């Protein structure tokens, strides 16, 4: 019973510490995922556990062993994403622009 209370105090101190650790982690995530992302057209997703090849708007193809800082389930092969300008990883997904006639038709 007393060991239980000691474990309770230990776990609450661990909670307090890992709070600030996850905050530092988030700060450095925002340090990497700042704002001036580059949009890329995701050509397709390949299995490896998924890796994606993308065609960034700088007419350049790129293979990503890890799919950035976004979930990886929907991720349609053509879903426009904001890939990092220098390290080329997917910081965020943005809604699809248009599909030729589907915008040519209101």
């Amino acid at each position: 019973i007393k060991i239980m209370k000691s474990e309770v105090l230990r776990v609450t101190h661990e909670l307090q510490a890992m709070k600030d650790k996850i905050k530092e982690n988030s700060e450095k995530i925002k340090v990497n995922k700042t704002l001036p992302y580059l949009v890329s057209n995701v050509i397709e997703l390949l299995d490896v556990g998924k890796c994606a090849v993308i065609k960034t708007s700088t007419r350049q193809t790129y293979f990503l062993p890890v799919i950035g800082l976004v979930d990886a389930e929907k991720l349609k092969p053509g879903d426009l994403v904001g890939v990092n300008k220098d390290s080329y990883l997917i910081l965020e997904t943005l809604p699809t622009e248009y599909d030729s006639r589907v915008k040519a038709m209101e």
Binding site: K28, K30, V31, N32, T34
Partner: protein, 61 residues
């Protein structure tokens, strides 16, 4: 050492920041704790200057 000599005894890196390589990229707190704590280690050397890598751009400012 003198007006004709600068002796870079050592260098310590700095955390990568989203700004890039600027004067806001030097964390005053990180710089401090590193300075006092290296002084404790046995490296009580004043900060001579800074360095940054221009990858493939050559050497210039």
């Amino acid at each position: 050492v003198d007006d004709y000599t600068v002796r870079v005894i050592d260098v310590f890196a700095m955390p990568q920041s989203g700004t890039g390589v600027s004067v806001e990229a030097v964390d005053p707190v990180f710089q401090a704790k590193m300075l006092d704590m290296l002084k404790q280690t046995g490296r009580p050397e004043m900060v001579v200057g800074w360095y940054h890598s221009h990858p493939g751009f050559g050497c210039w400012l």
